[PDB]
Design a protein around this ligand. Sequence first.
Ligand SMILES: Cc1ncc(COP(=O)(O)O)c(CN[C@@H](CO)C(=O)O)c1O
Ligand SMILES: Cc1ncc(COP(=O)(O)O)c(CN[C@@H](CO)C(=O)O)c1O
Ligand code: NA
Ligand code: NA
Lengths: 391, 388
Amino acid sequence: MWFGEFGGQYVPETLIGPLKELEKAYKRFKDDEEFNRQLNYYLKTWAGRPTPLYYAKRLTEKIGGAKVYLKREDLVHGGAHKTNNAIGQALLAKFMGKTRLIAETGAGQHGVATAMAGALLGMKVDIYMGAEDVERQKMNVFRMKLLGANVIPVNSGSRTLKDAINEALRDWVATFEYTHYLIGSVVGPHPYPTIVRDFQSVIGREAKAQILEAEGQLPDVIVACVGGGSNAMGIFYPFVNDKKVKLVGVEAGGKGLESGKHSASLNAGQVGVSHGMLSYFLQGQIKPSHSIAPGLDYPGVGPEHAYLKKIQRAEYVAVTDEEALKAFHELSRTEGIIPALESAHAVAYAMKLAKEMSRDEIIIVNLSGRGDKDLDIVLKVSGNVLEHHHH
Amino acid sequence: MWFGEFGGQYVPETLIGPLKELEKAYKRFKDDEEFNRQLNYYLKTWAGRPTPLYYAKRLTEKIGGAKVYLKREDLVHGGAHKTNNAIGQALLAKFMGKTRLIAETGAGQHGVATAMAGALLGMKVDIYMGAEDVERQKMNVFRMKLLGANVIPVNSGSRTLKDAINEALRDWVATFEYTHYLIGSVVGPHPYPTIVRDFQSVIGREAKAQILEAEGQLPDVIVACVGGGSNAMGIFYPFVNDKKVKLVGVEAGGKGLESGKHSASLNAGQVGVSHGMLSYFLQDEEGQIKPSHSIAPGLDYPGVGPEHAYLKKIQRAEYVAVTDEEALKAFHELSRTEGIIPALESAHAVAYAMKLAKEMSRDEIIIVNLSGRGDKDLDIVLKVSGNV
Ligand SMILES: Cc1ncc(COP(=O)(O)O)c(CN[C@@H](CO)C(=O)O)c1O
Ligand SMILES: Cc1ncc(COP(=O)(O)O)c(CN[C@@H](CO)C(=O)O)c1O
Ligand code: NA
Ligand code: NA
């Protein structure tokens, strides 16, 4: 239910019924032999798990400090970690007898992942997406439609991710008998922060096994970008009880923390109740975020991160648009890996942190997705660079 | 060198030395423990091998015939099988002491794969690409630039893949002491058809282990699309000596085999010589190499590898064609039914597998090589199919 003070289930009575049935089913099926037979089968044969853990040898040597490893969620089917949660919850929906999936999306990656998982399991898919996001993500919207999903543009409110979540919750209240609302991050009312984190925890379990195989020891630091916080919780959670392992979440610093154009909810947000949970939200109404990374757009953050921040188990930092863009280019040129702009925030901070650390020490960076989806954004900025040759 | 009467080394004397040195180096490193340790390390940790073998259960049940399995080369780093060969040859080049990679590309996929492998290994990369292809593939050209590679637009001739290969060979003759020419398909003079097939054979070795693990038996048919022929050779080669396993290569039927707008070199072409090999080519009465057409950008090489010409000759493999229309329907079908957006090249294989499955029995098994993912093709499909 709660993570310290944070999280909870602060919703109207119309949502209590749907959420209670979801909790019961989840407790029912999470450790069921037949459910896990199918989930592991799809994660293996369809999604391509396990993803590798890659030693960024050239990057490590260039910086001249700590060893930089990359957990390669960019290689998951769909090109992002979102698929892990999409498969888990969609299979849960199938086991519950649901025939329809709905989901919110901002960047379009979770919408694509949900569309993919729904197509896989023969379920109807409607994706709620803010009209301003629909406009910025033409090709992800087209991907969703190719996969058999319908994209419902949300014209209410600010026409962004927060509004898409609002419309999806309204839909689910009416249609929960046959519809499962597939939330895409560790956010919303209980049991969603737990369910999404549980379905992303495979990342950390693989990473722990892989780093023990590669280095004979646990990492000194784990760095992941934090939007809502699902990829970060996925890689963090299996290391939480290893006190050796430092955990660093990287939020979108945008145009600077002083500018008020960022998505650093943990850093500069206010504690409040929204979307059925107590957590940090940026504001005194909740406002749309800003980041070069379309995926770091949720105005709040998961309550388990708010908890880990308060008990000082994880540190949370910010990286600017400029810094993330530099890391996008650096990783591409140095390791031949084009990262998602979300993931590039984590790469950017890991590079700064590696410089200050010892050559015997180990950083794992969660590479939450690949950057094919971001090429239009990077082309637009790269085309506008003045004297690109000598700079 | 020869696959029956096909293959050879039809190059000027200036390239015999470089090809001899490559052949010597390859024979040495192919079975070297350290070379193979490093290659397998990069294929595992960087490229993400093994790729899974996926049972397309919904597609199988919709068609109501044979079991359709998909070898998921769409999940290799870069999104296509081209990476397997790019790493192999780039590592070979590094072991030979070379500092520079050059490569041809038409669709841009091999160009990207070469740029990725060169970036990984700290080598300079120049990609030769026909100006007509540069214009069609601006995002792949941009990918190559992001990876640190220099794309050289080829303005001579027809300004397509055949002209890029000619310029690449021109470069290599002058720069071979420090440059490796990283050919992207099972084409060119010996030893390239052999080397590329060997570096793609991992696909078939995995697929064989995976199908035995899944079903306890070898497949009845293997279906792969055939451009130059590398993804097909990769999945075919380990099953060649298994007599019961049928091999089906799928060429681009384009607007139709009678339309004169296709890339079916085995089905409709003539025996000829180009790019250092004796093989099947689409060539006119003047002996000149015709333009290829296909909705799939990657099925644009106007010939085919000599090992496929051989397998056709001895009737070990069958070669068929699938039209633009059929490939496009399969692109949509797979996306909707299995949640996998395939490359348009791979969709040719999917299209034929769907036709072939319907005729066959429910107990029988088909493996389709899904050579790449379709993210690169979304603009093409948006234009041709339209928005929804
Ligand atoms: C590749 C990638 N990496 C990271 C994130 C951040 O989300 P997380 O903090 O839940 O991992 C996103 C979010 N993307 C969400 C929100 O916009 C979506 O609807 O697609 C992403 O697409
Ligand atoms: C995804 C995919 N699948 C299949 C093929 C066909 O080539 P093959 O027959 O060598 O596998 C290609 C070729 N693509 C080549 C030739 O245009 C390139 O330079 O990129 C491809 O990109
Ligand atoms: Na946020
Ligand atoms: Na051809």
